[PDB]
Every structure is written in structure tokens, then in C-alpha cells.
Design a protein around this ligand. Structure first.
Ligand SMILES: [K+]
Ligand SMILES: [K+]
Ligand SMILES: [Mg+2]
Ligand SMILES: [Mg+2]
Ligand SMILES: [Mg+2]
Ligand SMILES: [Mg+2]
Ligand SMILES: [Mg+2]
Ligand SMILES: [Mg+2]
Ligand SMILES: [Mg+2]
Ligand SMILES: [Mg+2]
Ligand SMILES: [Mg+2]
Ligand SMILES: [Mg+2]
Ligand SMILES: [Mg+2]
Ligand SMILES: [Mg+2]
Ligand SMILES: [Mg+2]
Ligand SMILES: [Mg+2]
Ligand SMILES: [Mg+2]
Ligand SMILES: [Mg+2]
Ligand SMILES: [Mg+2]
Ligand SMILES: [Mg+2]
Ligand SMILES: [Mg+2]
Ligand SMILES: [Mg+2]
Ligand SMILES: [Mg+2]
Ligand SMILES: [Mg+2]
Ligand SMILES: [Mg+2]
Ligand SMILES: [Mg+2]
Ligand SMILES: [Mg+2]
Ligand SMILES: [Mg+2]
Ligand SMILES: [Mg+2]
Ligand SMILES: [Mg+2]
Ligand SMILES: [Mg+2]
Ligand SMILES: [Mg+2]
Ligand SMILES: [Mg+2]
Ligand SMILES: [Mg+2]
Ligand SMILES: [Mg+2]
Ligand SMILES: [Mg+2]
Ligand SMILES: [Mg+2]
Ligand SMILES: [Mg+2]
Lengths: 118, 97, 205, 152, 51, 244, 124
RNA sequence: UCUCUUACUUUUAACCAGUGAAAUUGACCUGCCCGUGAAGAGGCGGGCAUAACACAGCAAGACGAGAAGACCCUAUGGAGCUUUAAUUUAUUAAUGCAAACAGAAACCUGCAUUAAAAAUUUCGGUUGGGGCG
RNA sequence: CCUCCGCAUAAGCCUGCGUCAGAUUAAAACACUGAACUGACAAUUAACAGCCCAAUAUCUACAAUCAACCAACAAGUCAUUAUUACCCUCACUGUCAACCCAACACAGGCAUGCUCAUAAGGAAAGGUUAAAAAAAGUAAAAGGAACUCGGCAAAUCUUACCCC
RNA sequence: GCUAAACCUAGCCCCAAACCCACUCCACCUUACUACCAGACAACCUUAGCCAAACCAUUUACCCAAAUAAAGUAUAGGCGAUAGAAAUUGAAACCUGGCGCAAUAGAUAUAGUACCGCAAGGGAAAGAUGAAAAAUUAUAACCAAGCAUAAUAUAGCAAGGACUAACCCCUAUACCUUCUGCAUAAUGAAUUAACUAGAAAUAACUUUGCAAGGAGAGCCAAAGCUAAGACCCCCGAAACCAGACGAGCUACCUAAGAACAGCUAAAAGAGCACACCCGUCUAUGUAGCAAAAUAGUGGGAAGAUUUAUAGGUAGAGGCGACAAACCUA
């Protein structure tokens, strides 16, 4: 391509233009309504027991009449409690490894560079 | 094959670092401190091993009744199986009766 | 975009070049070189700043810095600590020998005071205006950051507007007047589009 | 627009209007012979032929008569060093026929004459290699491999 | 049985380093003489004639 | 590694943060309580020490409650704390015989009762224990109010307590609106169970129902920043005029 | 032998599967009896393209421009620049009341507006 | 088909060129006879024979190779199945009583008795080829 | 010279013998243009097909088989009206290939519509020699089951009987 | 001198401390990752068995919220294998560590990816120059088996005694394991490298301390008591139980479809005979083309037929023109 950087400049310009227009609308929405999100939503447990942010959709009939919406379950049954602990402990092992590994790097790094301590 | 062709990197050990020059200090805290402290209280490590000694089965049994409620589900299940196996090994297998 | 392995080793060739791909294929895994941690604020070596070589083949010689690598704390000086390699070699031609510079660690170079061309240590301080500057430990004098050409290479002092370049008088003119209307509402007023039909309420869930 | 929530429409509702569109089309040269009025574009999946018809007339003021689109599958055969299949993204190819009998031919964006520099260009590194290569000569067979540097 | 050789090297040009780089090659000597000198014919005879 | 807290303490840790910590203080105390229910399917010892006939020594004795299984159908009636007993038995009452599974179920009756506070008749499923306890309490309304939560063992029974307590607190005229004298007479018979309406509104609710109830009290559309900034601007302008 | 780790698209499956699965394009109508598709004009997004004649701005900006610091817009900054001068002027005059908030520009409700703010009923 | 086989073509085969497996393998510089031996010897004893060496055939030997083979026996090792093996009726069904009712009954529940259909577990050793221990 | 194959659809598969370039170089041989390998680029354009149906009541005894005879049982594969509501219109998706399931470029498995021998699709022989043994096929004097557990194979195109 | 061999990091393990993550846009319970229509659909229910009792049938340890001590005591128990308290006593507590691992190790992890299986599920392998690759004129020598350099000369567990001399002479029945006894024609081993198998202190003994007392609460003591040292392996079943996943093969069923030339006959679970289905006999093949095929010969081929598609029945079971058949080789 003759000038590949030209595309990057326009894409940066397009994203900057989109940020400015979006920011102005967001500032006005907080003034008139105070809502921080332009799309309605709520925090609901899924079938897997984890807290998720469910983004609402547009419907013509109320939710108590929707055939397809009512099949979707937003509650966790008791048998998911054990799996939640298992997944939490899995992250704890991952978190522990990261914390312990960083300390190992520092201890080794002072052996070859003692001036770091001094 | 199976043996290195070069010498290992040289290792220099500081015989007078902070830890070695102060190793064994306060081991006579009870004798020289009017028995206010005990040398076993200077042990640092697992809460179920400070000032206590036993075989593998006794360590597993003691660990389960002290930190068993804090262990992970996988670790707790492994500990329970280890106790079951060690119970069968020591009380049913061996050369002497 | 940028695709760097977790233990990618930076070298003289910039990342993403054709030579870098051959030198560092995505599958290879080498021992990560130990790098002394240096804060970005603590770093005091910049391009275009003359430094003296403390250790090397030719120590005590001062040369301008053309490139710096923060990842490995590397300093490149033109005309100093350079080996010789054949460039443009083919099957029939032996090649042309050119001097190729070698990187220098930050501890292998030492900044020199502008007044006295001697090695010295510098410490970061502040001026009266509040701008951060570096002050030498001995014979404290201000050493400003030398001017260096930009990465892209555009010279603002030799810049001519093109056919699709906004003029400065139009890129700085303020046309925005704050109000309580969205862009969608404002455009219809300017364009003149009228929509008398109303939007019926819907259910969100 | 893509990656946006389209407001739902009900009977007698307001006209759906888009003021800023994120659709980007690129004109491509057809790989096979096509009619003169036929023009080929690459459009995002979220774009339809009805949107494309209003896209060209709305923005470029290009009258279009017939629009036909097809979805092209991207080959997933490529595998990397980890034996993981590399997926080439699928793209939608749109064929546009001009309305008022206009004929469109894809221009040559890289003319050979323009590529050749009429003005003199003298690279510093290139000059060093060229001059030394021409000055240096092949070893004379009659010299039998004896170095020619020595004048003795 | 799916293992293969690591044949993935391709030939690249060493004529020019990667472009759009601030660093440039520093050269100490020129390629050729700026103005070629042609010694006068018969200088060998003048070698004997030192005066 | 190890968890900071034991697993059985995580339930009470969830009451320290989130919407649970914002629940009323009196309601939170009722959940943490683990009061022992009244024995039903076993006879308590009655004493703390007894003399073992074998060795003639004063040994300590403890009452070990028998686990009770309450079917979900028991939450729509007043079983009096009875329920299914899931246990084992020995054939022919011989320890050397094989062990078999045995389930004991209470005898259920769909009796009808009348509540004076609510002025309504209910057709509920009850056992003989509930019938006896109501007679010992001298009325259904007394039985509901006197019996604690761990002894009622019925979600519907807890809802009746909440309904009755609100009428004893609000002094609701809906109870015989045409009989002012009769209305006061009923409320003077249950005056000993008066509870403030603030605390009587959370009685019997489960943890899940309390969370939703508290969420509704905290649910409101956010105030627009325009209204907030108007107060800030005027307040600053008022102080500005004072300096002038 | 099926590749379960591949993106499921409309190109896979029998005729019923291929016709029901799409690519993400929003519908612009509905199917009537006899499989006859009815297109709604109001469901087709109509592009509001302005006139670009005599437009000062250009896609690029000349390098001879100041490096002004970035000042992201906020609700408080927008309120002070637009609404505050109107309120301050009326406050000095002495005729100010909360009832006239709609006069300053405040919108108590978003209903009855072509462009609602929450939830928004317009495209980008 | 045979007395009684024979001829020919094709594939295979063998040779030249290309590509290139598998079971197998303690180490072998790997002979015959007689004898001996854990009872069937290339290896021990006594005789005989014996330059090295590849290719093509053959199938007597290497108790040839291939799945701890089939076949009998062993185990206080398993499982299926059958039953007048032992241990049970939890469960199911039918009655009885208590309970609970109306004024009689049913449903339900508890405790029993009958079966039904199942559940758990085991199959003592010694001796005896034509027996009825 | 073969063709018991072919073409298309359905299902399945998912770019998998199109172009260009390659230090290229292993598809069970070959290979420079080498290429069923790698990189890059190109592509299959809807009329066919898929994706349908405003509500409430009310309607639908008499097969099919050339449906006309006849003859059945196994008794069958196809229908609306009334009133109200209703007038915007051609979107979306599938479209390639020598292809799929059998660990393989596997002598196997594989639905329907046409062609019933092709107008389509192919190649049994790497070269040589013409030993044994082995597989397949053909021919045979005189005899014709003498072979063998047995007319098994092969030739031929047979008769009669018993058991179940 | 080839193949190779070496080369230290990635990262991990065990503790301590501290209570952890989860809204860029869009999509995602229908066939998930699919903008957009009238629903009613609901969670809760003793674990069992292996195993030990040398069978087995009652029984047989499983954190339940303070270490130690009371104490393996009271009790429980085919009073037997074994199980087992309480009153009471009261504890210190400083995260930033290692007589942990170093690419067959340490997590499986370069990754739950490649790959395998319909699914549940199983589950890898490997990397190595240098300050500089913008020094490849590069990261020199030597090292397993395997080869090459360099085929072989009577005779024999291949060696030993020897010898001027390789052989020739003389002497010599491989190893391990299992058995009374193996050169045994009994087991295992082609070979190289790495990995791979004896854990417990009651008593007694030995060596110190103190001593009618010993011990840093409890416990023992008629020379004992305290402390240390020093004794108790690896691989392999067929099974059993619990909870899941499977009827895309097959067994049968349901829904709505499709196929069956020609001839003879008659309104046939008829005859001959293609497609099609089936697999009688023989041969080839036997790590094959094929974890059941090829060639020829056969049975049926308008029906209790064949077949595509979707759905159903799931192991204490299904299903079955009962073959103990079939339910993913
Ligand atoms: K043989
Ligand atoms: K395919
Ligand atoms: Mg299309
Ligand atoms: Mg050959
Ligand atoms: Mg092999
Ligand atoms: Mg020999
Ligand atoms: Mg012999
Ligand atoms: Mg002999
Ligand atoms: Mg031979
Ligand atoms: Mg043979
Ligand atoms: Mg025995
Ligand atoms: Mg049992
Ligand atoms: Mg159509
Ligand atoms: Mg040949
Ligand atoms: Mg003849
Ligand atoms: Mg004979
Ligand atoms: Mg005969
Ligand atoms: Mg005969
Ligand atoms: Mg025959
Ligand atoms: Mg729709
Ligand atoms: Mg709809
Ligand atoms: Mg046992
Ligand atoms: Mg047994
Ligand atoms: Mg590993
Ligand atoms: Mg060697
Ligand atoms: Mg000899
Ligand atoms: Mg089961
Ligand atoms: Mg089926
Ligand atoms: Mg016919
Ligand atoms: Mg027939
Ligand atoms: Mg059949
Ligand atoms: Mg037969
Ligand atoms: Mg067949
Ligand atoms: Mg027939
Ligand atoms: Mg099914
Ligand atoms: Mg059948
Ligand atoms: Mg039978
Ligand atoms: Mg049988």
C-alpha cells in the first residue's frame, strides 16, 4: 500500500468523532434522566449461578405473556452451589500462583542485581 | 549421554548473611527468660505443625480437624482419601503384628 | 495489531519487521533475559544525547545516541562499539562491509555534562517554573532533553497543507454552542426533515 | 448500522433514520468477466441490498437499478504451529448494476509509468553498494585465484 | 506420526533495513573516490628521473 | 491454599455485605437464632444427669433431636411440627436381623378453623398435634401468636402471624367495620402480643423474600442531575448575594 | 466426525436450517400468506446525508496545530455552560421558581418525544 | 473329481529402477551320529565331518511365531440363572384393628397378619476313572 | 480398451487438482511447468430452494388403482363458509470442488430423478524375463465318479424316493 | 563422522497473609452466541457399595466448628472385627518463607489446545546460540545404542589359561525367577537412555541427662524417667455401588413419504427374472481392499417387502417372529 498509515489516521479520526458525539449524548442523558446507561438492564443470576448483566430487549407484549421469554430461567438451583465453590477455588489457585510467582521473580532478580536492594 | 559436558555454574554461599549469622538465636528463651516463652513458640509454619510432631497419618488427621473447614474442596477430598488409605495401610499391612 | 509472545525477546530489529519474524518465529521459546527494573520516570537517557562509554572495546569515547530500547535498557551510539558485517551479499558477490553498532547497557554508559566533557551522575529535580529537569550530582547544571526528529519524520517547520488537510484557522474555530439537544434532533432542524408521527411506547425486559 | 440496537417499529410509527452509519464498503476488481454496468463491492454482513441501494444514492448519489449480494465463505483449512485452524473471516460480495446505462471499469491504480521515477533518486545506502559492485571485477581465471590487491 | 520438519525460512532482502526507522546506518568511508585521478602516461620513466 | 473463613461461615458473611446488610436489625437477629424446637417424635430425658444401672454412676445425659423431613406440601398447612421420619429399622426388632428403611408419616386432616382477628375461615391440612395445641392455647389466634417459628414448622403459619400482628399494630378498622365495640373487644384480648408495625412487617419472611422486599424499598428512578445542579447553583447564588 | 469447535453459520445444516439462520442483518418486514414478503418503508433505515458543499473541514488536520490538553465533557460542565447563565439572569431579576424548570429546558418526562434519552429509540 | 496328469494365457513370481512395512529377536563364532540329562540336545560325554561366501527353492528341527489359547484343577476369587438354600417384607396388593368421620361409608395414617414381586449372601473339606458313596 | 457407469437433487462435508508464487518438494512410484504441499489472490449473484398464514365460530358419510367397466378389503394419501380485521410489497439464507460415513486418495456403506448404453465417465500393463510353488481361466486322447466323509468344485441343465 | 548428545529457564509445589472475579459496543435457554407477539412450565425427598470381620447376613473409622490433657478411659459391639465420648483442663499466633521441583521433574498444561469418542468423558507431545542476528565469516574438540570409517576363513554360551603370534592347543552345560531338582526344548528380557518398589517406635536394646525421683501442667515410678538413634514395599484383576451420558449402528414402535423393469398368469404373503434386499455353497483373503471383504454360485424380489427423514422406549432397564439376540466395531 502506498501510504498504509493513512487508514490508521482515518480510523482514529472516526473513533474520536464517535467518542465526542457519544459523550455529548451521555452528558445530556445524565442531566435529563440521570441514567448512566442508554440501554436498560439489570443484574440477574443465570442458570449457572453467576451474576451477569442482562441487557434488556424490545418487545410488544409484557413479559408475563411472552412465551419464549418465560422459558428462560434467571435463577440458580441448589445443585449449582457446589460448582460455584469449585469455580471460586479454581480462581483462587490461579490468583495464588500469580502472587507467588511475582515474589519469586523479585527474589531471583536481587541475586544478580544486589544494587537494587542498596 | 546423560551427563553434562560442561562444568556447572559456580555457586557462592554467603556464610555470614543475616539469616545464618542469626540462626539459632533465642533458642534458650525459656531458660534465660524466666520461662515466659517456649522455644516451640518460635516455630513458624503451618498452624497444625507448630510445636508438634507425628507420622504421616497423624499429620493428616491433625490437619483435617484444625484447618479442614478452610481447605479447598479438591484438597479436602484428597486429604480424606489419604487418611482412608493410610488407615488401611498401617492397620492392615506390614511385616510385624 | 501487535502479537507478542509472553516471553518475546526484543532485539535491534524492530518488532513486526521481516527480519524479526525470521529471528523470532511464534513457536520458538527462549530464556527471557533478566532486565533490571527501571521506572520510566527514573530513566534519563534519550535519543540525540551524547554519552560516554564506560566499558567496552573503545571506552571513554563520546558519541550521540540514535536509539534507546526501554525493554532491555539498551543504548545505541553511532560510530562507537560497532562490529563489521557484509551487507548485500549474493551468490556471486562477496558483499560490502559496513560498521554495525552494538547495544550498550545503561550502566555501560554515563552522561556527560555539557560544560565539562567528563562522565558524571545526574539526579532529577525541578526548576522554578515547575518543569522537571535533570541535575548533575557534581557541578550541578541544567541538562535539557536534546531535540530529536519525530518517529514519523514529519517536519512541522517544513509542512505544507495538502488538498485534504484542514486549515489551522478552520480546525481551531469554535462552532459548538452548548445546548440541551442531541445531534439527531439538531440535524433534523438544520436539514428540515419533519416527522409528525409519534413513537409508541414499548416494553423493555 | 451495525452493532447497534434498532428501535422496534409499530404500525404508524416514526420513520427509522440513521444519521451516522458505521458501514464501510470497498470497491474491488471482479475476478471474472462482468458486464460493463456491473460493479462489485465488499460489504459487511449486517448490510442488505436495500440498505446498499440507499447507501450509494444517499452518499455518492450513484443511481442503482439492480443489486445482488452473495456471502463468501472464508477458508478454515489453515493451521498454525499449534495445529489450530486459522479462520479467514467471511465477507459479503455485492454486485451493483448502474441505472442510467453508465458503464464502469475498474481503473489501474498502479500505472507502470507513474511507478518509474522520472526524477533522479539517489539513496545513500544504494549508492554505496552499486558503485563498489561495478568497480570490483570478477577474478581473472589466468590469475588462478591469486589475490589482485597486491601490485607485485 | 504427524510430525514434520521445521522448514519455514524464507529469503528476505538485506539491501535495506526496515523502513520508517529513526536509526540510520552510520558509514565511516565513502564507496569510491569523489574525483578519479588518472596518473599521466610515462610516469614510470619519471620515477628514474627523480629531479 | 486455604480459605480465609470456614465454609460454614460464608452464609453469615453474605449478611455482612450487599443488600442483606441493609435489612432491618431486628429481622437479622431472628435469622441468626438457632433456638431448639419443641421435641415431638422423641421423649426428652428431663434431667441433666442420671444414674447408670450398670455401674451405679452419675453420668451426663443429652437430648439428641431426631431429624424431621418436611415435605413441600407441609408449608400449606399446620402440621404442628410433625413430619416424615426417614430412618432405619431392624426386622422383628432384632439387632441381628437385616436393616430396612422405614418412613413414618403423620395422619393429615383437612379441618376448618375460624380466625377472630382476620374474621375469615380457613380450610387447612392439620394433624392431631395441631388440634391438641390449639385447644391448649385456647384458640387458633393464640396458637399462631404464641408458637415460635421453629415450632410452627409452616410457612403458611408464619404468614398468618404476620397478618395477625399487622392488624394488632395498625388497629385496622377492617375487622368488623360496622361493629366498633366488637372490634375493640377482640384487640383487647390479644393486646399482649403487640409489636410495632415497623418490626411486625418482617415477621415470617424468608431470606429470599426479605431481599426482594428491601430491594423494592430501595428501588427508585435516579434523580436527574438537572434537579441536583439547580439546587447547587441557587445555593451558591444565594451565598453570593449575601457577600454583596 | 462433526467439528463442534467451528462457528455455526447458515451454510451448515439441511434446507430448513439454512433458511432460518441469518447473518445478523435486521429484518425489514414480515412474511404473509403464500410466502409473500411485505417490506415496510419505515422499517428500512433512511440515511440522513447532509449537503457537503462549501464545507470548511477536511479529513486530515495540518501538523501546525497546538497540542491542547484533552477535556472530556461532563454533565456538570454541560450544565454550567448552557443552563447556568439562563438561571443566573432570572435569579438576579428575582423571578425564579421550580415550576418553570421546563422553561429553562428541563424535561420531566421523555414520553412524547421523537428522540427519547432513556431508553433511546434512535440509531447511532 | 479320478485312473494320470498335461498344454497355454493372465496374476503372482524372479531380475532392473522408485517408494518402503509387520509379527519376531537373552547372547550366538548357530553341524551329523551315538550316549547322557528336569525323562525329546546346534551348546554336556565319546566319535565323525568341516576354507569363506551370496542368490533361488524346500518345510524335518529350532518342543517355530501369534491372544498368560483350548482342555482338567485350585481360590473361604466373581457373575448369570433356577429353587421346597439361608435371611427379610422395607416396597406392592388384599384384609383386620386403632385412628379419623358421618351416622353409614370412603380417602389418609399407624400397627399387624397373608401373599405377590424382589433383595442380600453362600455353594465345608477327605477319598473314589465305569458311580448311585 | 473398459464402461454394473454417468449427470443432478437430497443428506453430509466446509474451499479440499481455479490462478500466481514458493528456501518449495513426498502424494504409500514420479515430478522441472514441480503439485491432491505452503503462501497469496480469486470465487458460488435468484426466478430454483428455504424462511409463510388476523381472529372467532362453523363446515368436511361416498378411496386409490388411466377410474370408465368390473371386483374387493386391509377401508384408505389431499375440500370450507359466515362476520370482523385488512390494502405496505420482492427482504433474508443456501448456490464451489475430484466432496460424504469407514483411523487412509480404503475393491466397503450410500436415498430419490433421469440415461438402460451412453451424447457421459474412465485406464487392468513401471520395464524385463517367461523357473518352481500359488491364484484365475481355457483346452484334452481312451475311460466317465473308479476321486471323495459327501457328485465338493466343474461340466451338464436330469429322473425317482425317504426323514423333518 | 553421521544420527545424536549436552546446555536453564519457563513455570510449578507446599505454607503464610488476605475473604475473590464477573456492563466497551453487539449477540447468546429457539438448532445458545439467532433485533421484533397471548404465556402459564417448576427447585426441596435417609446415600449406597467396595472394603475389614481372613466367607458372610448385625456391624466396620470418614473435618462439623479449641490445640493439648482427661483417653484410647467410661461406654458400644455376631461383647468380635472394631467403634468411642463427656464433665473438666486451656493457645500461642511476627505474610513476603523452602536441608520444594528444574522440561520423562514440578500443576494435565506451551493446553483442557491438538487429537480420540455420537455423547458424558479421556487427553497429549515439546523449548534451549550470543552483549549484539541491524555479528549466521554461526552455538570448536571429545561422550548411549545404531551405523560408517573397516564383510568374511575349520571348532562350537564365544571366554579363560596362555603364547613369539588374532585364531589354532587346553578348560568351561548363559542370566533371572519359580520348584526337591532347570544347559534345559519352563517363565521374562532386541537394545540404549531416563523413570520405577520397606512408610509406623508399644516393648526391648544401645548411647546421654537427672535420680527415689524423672518430665517445660496431664504421665510414669518397688531404679526409674526424659530425649535421640534404630523394624514393617511395588504393579495387576474379573467385580460392587452411586450419579451422569448414549436408540446418527442395531432391536421394536410412531409420524408423514418413496421404490418395485419385463414376461407368465391371475384380482395369489403366485411363478420366471432386473433394480433392490439377503448371504446357501465354494475359492481367494487371514496385520487382507475390508477390526467380516472379493469372485462365482445362490434366497426373496406387490410384500410378514425394501428404504430415506424426524421422534420414542436407557442398564435394578430397553427391546426381542427366544438367537441368552440386540442396545455405537
Ligand atoms: K520347518
Ligand atoms: K468437503
Ligand atoms: Mg442469494
Ligand atoms: Mg526393489
Ligand atoms: Mg517393529
Ligand atoms: Mg560356521
Ligand atoms: Mg540326544
Ligand atoms: Mg556332543
Ligand atoms: Mg536360503
Ligand atoms: Mg511357504
Ligand atoms: Mg482354603
Ligand atoms: Mg451389606
Ligand atoms: Mg421461490
Ligand atoms: Mg510388474
Ligand atoms: Mg477327457
Ligand atoms: Mg476310494
Ligand atoms: Mg467311491
Ligand atoms: Mg456313497
Ligand atoms: Mg455344486
Ligand atoms: Mg419477525
Ligand atoms: Mg413475530
Ligand atoms: Mg470380607
Ligand atoms: Mg467368596
Ligand atoms: Mg510436563
Ligand atoms: Mg557410538
Ligand atoms: Mg575347543
Ligand atoms: Mg445404578
Ligand atoms: Mg431410529
Ligand atoms: Mg414386475
Ligand atoms: Mg411372490
Ligand atoms: Mg431382514
Ligand atoms: Mg448349510
Ligand atoms: Mg456385499
Ligand atoms: Mg421368486
Ligand atoms: Mg431418538
Ligand atoms: Mg426381528
Ligand atoms: Mg431356544
Ligand atoms: Mg442356550
Amino acid at each position: 500500500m502506498p501510504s498504509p498509515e493513512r487508514l490508521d489516521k482515518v480510523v482514529d479520526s472516526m473513533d474520536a468523532l464517535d467518542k465526542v458525539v457519544q459523550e455529548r449524548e451521555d452528558a445530556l442523558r445524565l442531566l435529563q434522566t440521570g441514567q448512566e446507561r442508554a440501554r436498560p438492564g439489570a443484574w440477574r443470576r443465570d442458570i449457572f449461578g453467576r451474576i451477569i448483566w442482562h441487557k434488556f430487549k424490545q418487545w410488544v407484549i409484557p413479559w408475563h405473556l411472552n412465551k419464549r421469554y418465560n422459558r428462560k430461567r434467571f435463577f440458580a438451583l441448589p445443585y449449582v452451589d457446589h460448582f460455584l465453590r469449585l469455580e471460586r477455588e479454581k480462581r483462587a489457585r490461579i490468583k495464588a500462583r500469580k502472587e507467588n510467582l511475582e515474589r519469586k521473580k523479585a527474589k531471583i532478580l536481587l541475586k544478580k542485581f544486589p544494587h537494587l536492594a542498596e | 549421554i546423560g551427563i553434562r559436558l560442561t562444568l556447572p555454574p559456580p555457586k557462592v554461599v554467603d556464610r555470614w548473611n543475616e539469616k545464618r549469622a542469626m540462626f539459632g538465636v533465642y533458642d534458650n528463651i525459656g531458660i534465660l527468660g524466666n520461662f515466659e516463652k517456649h522455644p516451640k513458640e518460635l516455630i513458624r509454619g503451618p498452624i497444625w505443625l507448630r510445636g508438634w510432631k507425628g507420622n504421616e497419618l497423624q499429620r493428616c488427621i491433625r490437619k483435617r480437624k484444625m484447618v479442614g473447614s478452610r481447605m479447598f474442596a479438591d484438597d479436602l477430598h484428597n486429604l480424606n482419601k489419604r487418611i482412608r488409605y493410610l488407615y488401611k495401610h498401617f492397620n492392615r499391612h506390614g511385616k510385624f503384628r | 495489531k501487535v502479537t507478542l509472545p509472553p516471553h518475546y525477546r526484543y532485539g535491534m530489529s524492530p518488532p513486526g519487521s521481516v527480519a524479526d519474524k525470521r529471528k523470532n518465529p511464534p513457536w520458538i521459546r527462549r530464556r527471557p533475559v533478566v532486565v533490571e527494573p527501571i521506572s520510566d520516570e527514573d530513566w534519563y537517557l534519550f535519543c540525540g544525547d551524547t554519552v560516554e562509554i564506560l566499558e567496552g572495546k573503545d571506552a571513554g569515547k563520546q558519541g550521540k545516541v540514535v536509539q534507546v530500547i526501554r525493554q532491555r535498557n539498551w543504548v545505541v551510539v553511532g560510530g562507537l562499539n560497532t562490529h563489521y558485517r557484509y551487507i548485500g551479499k549474493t551468490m556471486d558477490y562477496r558483499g560490502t562491509m559496513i560498521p554495525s553498532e552494538a547495544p550498550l547497557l545503561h550502566r555501560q554508559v554515563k552522561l556527560v555534562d555539557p560544560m565539562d566533557r567528563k562522565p558524571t551522575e545526574i539526579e532529577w529535580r525541578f526548576t522554578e517554573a515547575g518543569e522537571r529537569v535533570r541535575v548533575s550530582t557534581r557541578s550541578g547544571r541544567i541538562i535539557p532533553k536534546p531535540e530529536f526528529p519525530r518517529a514519523d519524520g514529519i517536519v512541522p517547520e517544513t509542512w505544507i497543507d495538502g488538498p485534504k488537510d484542514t486549515s489551522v484557522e478552520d480546525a481551531l474555530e469554535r462552532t459548538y454552542v452548548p445546548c440541551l439537544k442531541t445531534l439527531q434532533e439538531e440535524v433534523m432542524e438544520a436539514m428540515g426533515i419533519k416527522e409528525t408521527r409519534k413513537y409508541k411506547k414499548v416494553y423493555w425486559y | 448500522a451495525r452493532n447497534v440496537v434498532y428501535p422496534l417499529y409499530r404500525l404508524g410509527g416514526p420513520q427509522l433514520r440513521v444519521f451516522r452509519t458505521n458501514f464501510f464498503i470497498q470497491l474491488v476488481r471482479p475476478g471474472v468477466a462482468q458486464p460493463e454496468d456491473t460493479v462489485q463491492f465488499r460489504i459487511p454482513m449486517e448490510m442488505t441490498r436495500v440498505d446498499l441501494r440507499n447507501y450509494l444514492e444517499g452518499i455518492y448519489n450513484v443511481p442503482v437499478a439492480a443489486v445482488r449480494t452473495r456471502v463468501q465463505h472464508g477458508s478454515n483449512k489453515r493451521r498454525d504451529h499449534r495445529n489450530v485452524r486459522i479462520k479467514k473471516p467471511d465477507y459479503k460480495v455485492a454486485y451493483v448494476q448502474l441505472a442510467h446505462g453508465q458503464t464502469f471499469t475498474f481503473p489501474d491504480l498502479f500505472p507502470e509509468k507513474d511507478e518509474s521515477p522520472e526524477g533522479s533518486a539517489a539513496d545513500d545506502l544504494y549508492s554505496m553498494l552499486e558503485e563498489e559492485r561495478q568497480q570490483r571485477q570478477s577474478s581473472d581465471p589466468r590469475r588462478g585465484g591469486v589475490p589482485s590487491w597486491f601490485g607485485l | 506420526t504427524e510430525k514434520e520438519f521445521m522448514q519455514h525460512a524464507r529469503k528476505a532482502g538485506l539491501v535495506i533495513p526496515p523502513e520508517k526507522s529513526d536509526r540510520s546506518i552510520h558509514l565511516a568511508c565513502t564507496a569510491g573516490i569523489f574525483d578519479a585521478y588518472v596518473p599521466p602516461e610515462g610516469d614510470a620513466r619519471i620515477s628514474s628521473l627523480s629531479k | 491454599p486455604l480459605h480465609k473463613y470456614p465454609v460454614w461461615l460464608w452464609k453469615r458473611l453474605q449478611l455482612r455485605e450487599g443488600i442483606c446488610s441493609r435489612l432491618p436489625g431486628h429481622y437479622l437477629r431472628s435469622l441468626e437464632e438457632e433456638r431448639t424446637p419443641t421435641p415431638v417424635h422423641y421423649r426428652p430425658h428431663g434431667a441433666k444427669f442420671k444414674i447408670n444401672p450398670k455401674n451405679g454412676q452419675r453420668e451426663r445425659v443429652e437430648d439428641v433431636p431426631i431429624p424431621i423431613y418436611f415435605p413441600p406440601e407441609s408449608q400449606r398447612g399446620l402440621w404442628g411440627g410433625e413430619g416424615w421420619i426417614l430412618g432405619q429399622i431392624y426386622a422383628n426388632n432384632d439387632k441381628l436381623s437385616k436393616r430396612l428403611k422405614k418412613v413414618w408419616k403423620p395422619q393429615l386432616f383437612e379441618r376448618e378453623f375460624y380466625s377472630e382477628i382476620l374474621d375469615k375461615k380457613f380450610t387447612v391440612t392439620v394433624t392431631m398435634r395441631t388440634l391438641d395445641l390449639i385447644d391448649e392455647a385456647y384458640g387458633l389466634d393464640f396458637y399462631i401468636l404464641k408458637t415460635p417459628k421453629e415450632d410452627l414448622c409452616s410457612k403458611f403459619g408464619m404468614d398468618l402471624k404476620r397478618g395477625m400482628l399487622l392488624r394488632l399494630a395498625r388497629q385496622d378498622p377492617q375487622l368488623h367495620p360496622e361493629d366498633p365495640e366488637r372490634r375493640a373487644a377482640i384487640y383487647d384480648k390479644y393486646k399482649e402480643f403487640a409489636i410495632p408495625e415497623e418490626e411486625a412487617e418482617w415477621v415470617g419472611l424468608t431470606l429470599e423474600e426479605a431481599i426482594e422486599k428491601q430491594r423494592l424499598l430501595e428501588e427508585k428512578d435516579p434523580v436527574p442531575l438537572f434537579k441536583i445542579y439547580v439546587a447547587e447553583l441557587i445555593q451558591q447564588l444565594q451565598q453570593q448575594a449575601l457577600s454583596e | 466426525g462433526a467439528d463442534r469447535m467451528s462457528k455455526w453459520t447458515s451454510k451448515r445444516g439441511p434446507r430448513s436450517f439454512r433458511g432460518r439462520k441469518g447473518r445478523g442483518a435486521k429484518g425489514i418486514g414480515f412474511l404473509t400468506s403464500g410466502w409473500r414478503f411485505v417490506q415496510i418503508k419505515e422499517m428500512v433505515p433512511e440515511f440522513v446525508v447532509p449537503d457537503l458543499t462549501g464545507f470548511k473541514l477536511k479529513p486530515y488536520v495540518s501538523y501546525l496545530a497546538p497540542e491542547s490538553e484533552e477535556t472530556p465533557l461532563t454533565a456538570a460542565q454541560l450544565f454550567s455552560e448552557a443552563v447556568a447563565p439562563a438561571i443566573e439572569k432570572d435569579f438576579k431579576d428575582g423571578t425564579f421558581d421550580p415550576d418553570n424548570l421546563e422553561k429553562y429546558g428541563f424535561e420531566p418526562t421523555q414520553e412524547g418525544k421523537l428522540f427519547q434519552l432513556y431508553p433511546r429509540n434512535f440509531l447511532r
